[model samples]
Target chain A: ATKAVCVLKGDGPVQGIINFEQKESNGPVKVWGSIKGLTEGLHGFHVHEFGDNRAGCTSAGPHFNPLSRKHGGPKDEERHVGDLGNVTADKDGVADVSIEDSVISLSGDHCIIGRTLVVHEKADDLGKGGNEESTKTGNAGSRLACGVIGIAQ
Target chain B: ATKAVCVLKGDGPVQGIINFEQKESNGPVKVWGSIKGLTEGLHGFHVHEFGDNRAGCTSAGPHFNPLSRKHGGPKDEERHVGDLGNVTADKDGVADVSIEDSVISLSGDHCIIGRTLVVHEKADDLGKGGNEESTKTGNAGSRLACGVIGIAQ
Candidate 1:
């Protein structure tokens, strides 16, 4: 499996480092990260479709979905592979999280290397509300920070 | 559980219908579709991040990858959730496909309702190529057709 490391960046001090480890071929990939500069709340977090940071998060494109499914949480079977859900920040604006995801993978079709990791400005609705953007992007608001994923030895 | 449907429309003799069905709280959503007007070859397919079909397929945004994964086939372990891979057109230019994917869902953050379904003009290289676009959009060329996913009875 091709493990990866991503360093997120965005305007206004949003940043983090995400590491990926593959447990199996098809997935249940394990991810861990520590992020800072977030507001005191849940912020939208995801793997955008593009790795191009030339223009910031907006240039990274949208969330990653190869199955054409909907916006859902990390545990939901019906979710974007990139939808790790939100990472909440403490009052001091810091977040550290560890996740095991079935949708993402370190190799095969779901490989995350070379993609963009983005932190959103608001909480992602997770497609619960009936609003249009909820299903499209979990209503995660604007992208605050982003980073490109790269292969790790 | 939620259900959605997208009726694809194209400019260069491309068209299709994509159906999404989510049954569990977590997914393995059921997706089935019949597409037509494609060239007699493999064509790239994906669920765009945007449901805004106002500007046609271009408005649908990039492949859905909330995880910031790379481009790959539907079966690749490290692929975008929207990377449904290649749909082969028959000699008559029609393709019918049905798949159950664990990565996508109709409920929660992975819910795909209100997103856009896009058919590409070229086959997705699945990020295996050395080209930069391979990691971006699988080097899939121009959008041939698109549609918005909405609530289905």
Candidate 2:
């Protein structure tokens, strides 16, 4: 399996690490990350369009939606390539989630490497909430932690 | 004369270009730039310590104070090499200024190559404002625009 990783950093208190593992060329990729200093609730998580971290997370640009699909959860068929859904932090302000995703890829057209992983300040509505922002960005608030995806040996 | 220029872009409404020119090796560089969409008053202008524009302007760090001196204006010998004083805009939110300073150089220790140029949201107090924030950052507000210094050759 080819492995990829990202070391997240934030201007405020949030920090974490994300890992991606692909077992097959045309199979689901395993995504997992451990984060700390969250607010004990759900936070919007996604891959951003730009890998640039010059201004930390803010310079990473918007969500990765190359196919121009509507915002939806990771399990949805019409979701953006970045729509990884929420990461729920526990009462201790920590979170570790492992899941398999078919829409994301380690290589080829849907490849997520060279993009940015962004954790937002609020929960993602997952396109179920009736609002304009939900359809656009899932109504994610300010970017909290961000990092660039890198190929791992 | 040789020229070094910066193309400013902001996360907000600010935009501009800045140019620095020097005819001789040791002469003061003539610095000038025109900016638009600023407040109708003074805005802090200076060079920052880093040339990185990846994270936009915020990642550039603080003013280029290599001399480890107090934060003062261009006329002060103990001021940061980045200190270029304030740029005042008119009622139409436009600013144009041409000035010369002996403290800055295109070469040697004071060279500005591979650095960042920054414009701020408030007036620089010029180190005489008698406040803690005034001495550290001239109490300049949020970063409005940022650009990287590049050789014009």
Candidate 3:
């Protein structure tokens, strides 16, 4: 498999919304790519299931968790596969995160080759000092925004 | 698990401003928190990865996604875990989106607990034609406002 590749392209279910892109890397370590065109601030982003354009984002299912782990922070030991940490919009509401996990891949049984991206209406607690369930999902709330996942094809 | 929970309680994070609560909700399955103290117009909203009270909403990482999915809309078959779609304000820049989820939960794995919520400056594109990534995170662009996800302590 190539080390570099764009994850997605095009307008999402929710028009004029936020989106994400990634470039593959080598040595089980991936590098951060350019996260362009976003407002300035904080947005709750994540991965989802399905691709229902008509629903305007509501068509996608919850986090793509085949393991069905509790919603947790990226650094959390016991977390789900859909946790990619947060992204800041900077002065422009555009932020980026960097990470390369063994469980996460573009093509594989445990790969995220086919998933969606979702922006929440709230922030997550990161399980710092919250409940199991609350901490599970980082305390974030609402499906304020969403997107789908696909190969760079 | 105890129903009726305070998902988020504070303003979102952005460049220099952290617009506090403006919208909220509380349904049987999940409670939609509000961030009422925001201006009118279209605001970008999404779930974050971290929760740093010290940084206001800045410390909160990007959207929560441990799976490394692509940015997409909610309806796509392959979307991210943190993508919650988008929210629109009224002509008066006043809009509200409910805190609801089809499968993602606050207590279960893939729950949205500790994420942050942000308001954008522009509207989202529900994935127009000629865009497969559209099924990914909605083509919502620009971050105008922001907030964090937290339980009503």
Candidate 4:
């Protein structure tokens, strides 16, 4: 297994870092990390599709699931490769998000070498919930904040 | 200028491919792409800080800000370098998200070649424009969906 060092560099009121590991397990690769410096409230989190850091997070596209997949729950469908679950904020508004999937990969094959990260103002409807269009996703709306993921130190 | 491909690969509906061209300027780089098969509403967005594609979005870290910034409005004081604005879903549930900043980079000193993407269930407050935690990303909460950006084919 390979270890990628994830670092969150900021002097804000909230923030933290995570280390995603690439492994050849029976399920998707594993991701583990701790968040810090947030506002002590719950924040929306997700993995986008692209990695072109043109400027901010816009360069990164929607969730990376080019296979026309559906909104998947943590233990459900064989959804896209980039779908991980959610992370809740602690009393200090921080979350220690950790989960694994079945489709994600490395070695340049079905891997997210370059992409973006988005934080929302609320929680996800999870595809199983939400509005009519929510069948795909939980109808999560608005891009309260955006960012691009890159190699860590 | 160079063209960096963005791929959203993970668990979610309307999973597909979108390409982003990194147009480099004297300051920040310009990347443009489009997404299809989404709710015809607004969605939260953002970028993670790492490009470690070991498995799912876990390898991706916080926003890619070499300067160590905070979470604020698109154009706010003391914001993270990976902060992006918002994306509006059209009547067809497609979002043409585009924004600009002086923090993102495609190569060199602060190159963001590999990262992840994140979408939320609620809208961004755009710096405490409405509710209580409006000063910081509208206190966006919960992670509805997620994906990892990869090289576009």
Candidate 5:
């Protein structure tokens, strides 16, 4: 598939729709969606390894870093393939998420379908926090919402 | 099992942990959790029929009304078993949820394991809002976050 989607939900009162698409084979993946019911700030967003969240976002496992690289920004060459940095919510607790990253692949050896997409309670420090959790999770705090990636038309 | 858990995530920036526990059979089910990254207002919460949300909360199906009753408050006798009303968030967008209802069974013919729990974008009107959607979903808006109910130790 050349596109994918995720319907995110959390234990709390968070929900919204996210769609992913790419116009060309090696072109940038345009990830865009409107995330409603959020705080008025940034929240960490990424793709995780596991699609199974039967136990919650915790069950979604860690970030999708097949390269075993240190956590960094989406634009960083050494960053995890899942890293797309953070999204900012407006005053009404709505986030207009629009990200374009070439690193994310919908098909090929690094397909993200069936993986978990996660939104966090806090902003990702982009590996600049100089801490262990920052290198691992960007110290994004608890997961706010998540959903599994699915093939799209 | 006497307890269940659902880890919610959404298509947006919402996430949290929810736990369901019953101290005794045929007793009250205590649904409690802390949901973060929400709006500074009420959001609908409920148990859904299907455990699978691979397609999103849309995949979680409708309210878990095995009795096929109309939707109402958690305290209503003629309401859907999944009707738990709404939870409010503080200015910081964190909601400390604690609800106790005798109708929710942890182990019985209507066992909710493998079902789904959902948080909505709007407040539920408790089936009292003179409308058909209210009687069906309490007028709760789009789903925000959701997770599958799993057996808890």
Candidate 6:
């Protein structure tokens, strides 16, 4: 089975668990998880370029864009491979995420293992913020939580 | 400019930071770090095979043995590339480590980026524990604290 997982943590009070699974080699990656202690709104979510946490979230690098594409919504055709899009939180301060992306994978050339999952402090602009930063990071604010994607059972 | 870092954490109060640096390609990796809140004794230290943390430290897999070698001391002629022998803590429960391992590298075919660093709960028997586990893991005990070795600046 092609699967992976990340244990999300940060400096502040946040804890989360995310799982990525692909039933087949080239199939869509199904991602599901829940994060606690978030604000009641949308948060930027993407697969970071590196697994490094040497400098905490700052070291995870940019969104994983092996193809060197611009940042966009998860469903956008012209987008970074790691641009999985945002997570929305409820009034209770928790974000429950469920997504399936045809671009990302658990194996082959687009494998995301050994990379990282990053949850931003602000909503992602979906590359529509009308600036370069918007195209680069979807105007997502600073990283609030992150974890390296690792092999799954 | 080839370097990496790992932040070790566990279920207990142990906290540590380890950095890997290679001044040249195919050269020995200089490892340095300090672990606080230890038990004031020798602990096995090595790089695990995977970066996954879905099941806590249990998912880090086994000692990284790319060459299919036997488990031995860091200085032994035959040993796991991940093998760095043991770290000795002081009476105050702090392990200040400094070592250079030739088998492991920060780049090239043997690069360890995106892997995990693990400190074991017991002394490494270095293939002399007189059992099968000794040859596989140097008889290292449970994982105490571990972190993924991400790229560095």
True contacts kept of each: 0.00, 0.00, 0.00, 0.57, 0.04, 0.44
Model 5, position B146, has a per-residue lDDT of 85
Instruction: DockQ winner between 4 and 5, please give it.
Output: 4
TM-score of 6: 0.81
Question: Cα deviation in Å at residue A19, candidate 5?
Answer: 0.3
- lDDT, candidate 4, equals 0.55
TM-score of chain A of each: 0.94, 0.97, 0.67, 0.75, 0.96, 0.97
- CAPRI-style grade of the A/B interface in model 5: incorrect
Residue lDDT tens for model 2, B1-153: 666666567888888877788989888899887889898999999888765444567767888888888899999877999999899989999989687978878666787755677989999998888999888889878899976564442
In order of lDDT, best first, we have: 6, 5, 2, 1, 4, 3
Using lDDT as the measure, the top candidate is 6
True contacts kept of 6: 0.44
Against the true structure, what is model 2's DockQ?
Answer: 0.03
- Residue pairs in clash, model 6: A150-B52
Off by over 4 Å in 1: B1-153
Question: Per-residue lDDT of B1-153 in model 5, one digit per residue for the tens?
Answer: 366667777888778788888888878898888898889899999888765565667877889888999999988998887888899989998989999988767666666655678999999999888988889999889999987665444
Give the per-residue lDDT of model 4 (tens digit) for A62-121.
Answer: 777767878665566755555565567788766787777566654354655455455545
Question: How would you encode candidate 5's per-residue C-alpha lDDT over A1-153 as one tens digit per residue?
Answer: 366677787789777778888778787888999888789899999988766666667877888888899999998887998998999999999999999989888765455655678998989999998888888889988888887675453
Q: How many clashes show up in model 2? A: 3
Query: For model 3, how does the per-residue alpha-carbon lDDT over B76-152 read when each residue is reduced to its tens digit?
Result: 55455566566655554445566445424443445443344445444444344247744443545544444333222
Angstrom error of the Cα, residue A5, model 2: value is 0.4
Between prediction 2 and prediction 6, which has the larger TM-score? 6
lDDT of 3 at A98: 56
In Å, what is the interface RMSD of model 1? 14.6
* Winning model by DockQ: 6
lDDT of each: 0.74, 0.80, 0.45, 0.55, 0.81, 0.84
Q: After aligning candidate 6 to the native by TM-score, how far in Å is the CA of B152 from where it should be?
A: 3.1
Instruction: State the DockQ of every prediction.
Output: 0.02, 0.03, 0.02, 0.23, 0.05, 0.42
Candidate whose TM-score is highest: 6
In candidate 5, stretches whose alpha carbon ends up further than 4 angstroms from where it belongs are: B1-153
- Per-residue alpha-carbon lDDT of model 2 for A1-153, expressed as tens digits? 867766677788898878788989799989897999899899999988755555457767778888999999988887999999999999999989687899888777787765678889999999987999898899879999876665453
